[PDB]
């Protein structure tokens, strides 16, 4: 049997209602037990899946009223009456009328008010320099939306090479992101210059935020 979900992802504000679709190629209705063999699972980042709804509409011990599974035959729907911060997760539907098959999943994201990053810069550690390594890290903490740009400057010249950016998952408590921008050089490349700068550009302001240090 083929399982298919929609949407692949969506973003709503806290207090907003939401709807996720699940569709199968063959009726999941068992004539012998008179029940639809479809379950909904919730999976938060870095965790295992947790069962929310089974037999299409029966809620599992401990799961809030807000969640409401409906459907019959081949068309099903998970429905959150009102989303809050906890709901950050991908939601999977699973048929078990003929063996088992999972859907593709719906990622649930949250829209919130704009927030500005708190920018920290970090010179390389001693033990890293002792091993001939020099990594400079710019940390952008607790911002939204997720899109943000960081420019690096060495002594007044925009560096571009040896730079790797990485984001977190949307925070489960205030729904923000944090990101790190790393400039990786060798101890020689690093002792070659003195001024190290990173500038964070975000919709929150026209002029970027600056953090610098001198070797």
């Amino acid at each position: 049997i083929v399982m298919t979900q929609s949407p692949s992802s969506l973003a709503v504000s806290a207090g907003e209602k939401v709807t996720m679709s699940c569709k199968s190629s063959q009726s999941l209705l068992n004539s012998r037990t008179r029940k639809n063999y479809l379950a909904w699972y919730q999976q938060k980042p870095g965790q295992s899946p947790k069962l929310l709804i089974y037999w299409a509409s029966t809620r599992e011990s401990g799961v809030p009223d807000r969640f409401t599974g409906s459907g019959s035959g081949t068309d099903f729907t998970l429905t959150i009456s009102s989303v809050q911060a906890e709901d950050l997760a991908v939601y999977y539907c699973k048929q078990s009328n003929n063996l088992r098959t999972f859907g593709g999943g719906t990622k649930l994201e949250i829209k919130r008010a704009d927030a500005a990053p708190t920018v920290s810069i970090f010179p390389p550690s001693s033990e890293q320099l002792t091993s001939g390594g020099a990594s400079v890290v710019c940390f952008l903490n607790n911002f939204y939306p997720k899109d943000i740009n960081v420019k690096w400057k060495i002594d007044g010249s925009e560096r571009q090479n040896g730079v790797l950016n990485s984001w977190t998952d949307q925070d489960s408590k205030d729904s923000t992101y944090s990101m790190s921008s790393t400039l990786t050089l060798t101890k020689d490349e690093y002792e070659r210059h003195n001024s190290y700068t990173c500038e964070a550009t975000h919709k929150t302001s026209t002029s970027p935020i600056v953090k610098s240090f001198n070797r």
Binding site: P49, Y92, K94, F102, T168
Partner: protein
């Protein structure tokens, strides 16, 4: 307390074979179907196959995708479920879960997976298992942001704690990034300026693929 624990994960050479285990307790093992599920990084879940309860004869059934490749068996005396993986390749790189399926013959019966294991990551590569090096991140206010920079490890994953789990608020772990065959990530914590450096601050980096735990105390410059 129902418990499921996957084991065996790590780095496997392409073309080779691997066996996973799943220790259980807290329930009558033989009463339940056991299912295996997998999940490639940032991908959907995939059911692989199951093995039935005693009443049904302990028979096996697999998914189209892994018929002839993956095998399920169970030791009923030690209450352990097994998964045998042969001729592994890249597309097999994923997190493998064991899950407690249905028990239609005795007790409470409903269609769903009530309990999942924590998962064990398998990555299929020819590269080298190399534990991570951990460097501190410290400032050059009323609060101060610290963190640990983790580079040069393989395969995934690594887990980062602080004060052995006691410090859990203000913690931000960024995703991993892959470059030159090696991964790297940095985890940061924020605390009141009174808590540091006057008090102790440690991060606990764990890399299961090498059975390694590194600890790094955060000291001033």
């Amino acid at each position: 307390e129902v418990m499921l624990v996957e084991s065996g994960g790590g780095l496997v050479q392409p073309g080779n074979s691997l066996r996973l285990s799943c220790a259980t307790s807290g329930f009558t093992f033989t009463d339940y179907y056991m299912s295996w599920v997998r999940q490639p990084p940032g991908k959907a879940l995939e059911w692989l196959g199951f093995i039935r309860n005693k009443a049904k004869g302990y028979t096996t059934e697999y998914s189209a995708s892994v018929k002839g490749r993956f095998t399920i068996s169970r030791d009923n005396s030690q209450s352990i479920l097994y998964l045998q993986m042969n001729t592994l390749r890249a597309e097999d790189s994923a997190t493998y879960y064991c899950a407690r399926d249905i028990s239609p013959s005795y007790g409470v019966y409903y269609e769903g997976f009530a309990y999942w294991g924590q998962g064990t990551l398998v990555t299929v590569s020819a590269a080298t298992t190399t534990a991570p090096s951990v460097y501190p991140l410290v400032p050059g206010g009323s609060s101060v942001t610290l963190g640990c920079l983790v580079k040069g490890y393989f395969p995934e994953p690594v887990t980062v704690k602080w004060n052995y789990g006691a410090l859990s608020s203000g913690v931000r772990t960024v995703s991993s990034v892959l470059q030159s065959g090696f991964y790297s990530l940095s985890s940061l914590v924020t605390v009141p300026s009174s808590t540091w450096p006057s008090q102790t601050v440690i991060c606990n980096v764990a890399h299961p693929a090498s059975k390694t735990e590194l600890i790094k105390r955060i000291e001033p410059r």
